[PDB]
UniProtKB/Swiss-Prot annotation, chains A, B, C:
The central domain consists of 12 alpha-helical domains (19-40 residues long) with coiled-coil structural patterns. The chain holds residues 458 to 484 of 487 of the full protein. This is Fibritin. Chaperone involved in tail fiber assembly and retraction. Acts as a chaperone helping to attach the long tail fibers to the virus during the assembly process. During phage assembly, twelve fibritin molecules attach to the phage neck via gp13: six molecules forming the collar and six molecules forming the whiskers. The gene is wac. It comes from the Viruses. Homotrimer. Interacts (via N-terminal domain) with neck protein gp13; this interaction allows attachment of the fibrous collar and wiskers. It is found in: Virion.
Length: 27, 27, 27
């Protein structure tokens, strides 16, 4: 598939297992 | 809606508020 | 110029040079 827009919520996101997950967590 | 291709410039981006932002800007 | 899904392998991904790169490359 193609990837949809990430949340519109002030936060940056990486992509993991077909979903948007916060970057802050991994960092 | 869907995300577009990110810039092509040798650096890595994440997805935020409907734009591609540098990873270094968070690290 | 929609971008296809990242590999399904449990890893966080950032977009770079028209490809998916592992977040941990830079961590």
């Amino acid at each position: 598939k193609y990837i949809p827009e990430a949340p519109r919520d002030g936060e940056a996101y990486a992509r993991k297992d077909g979903e948007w997950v916060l970057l802050s967590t991994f960092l």
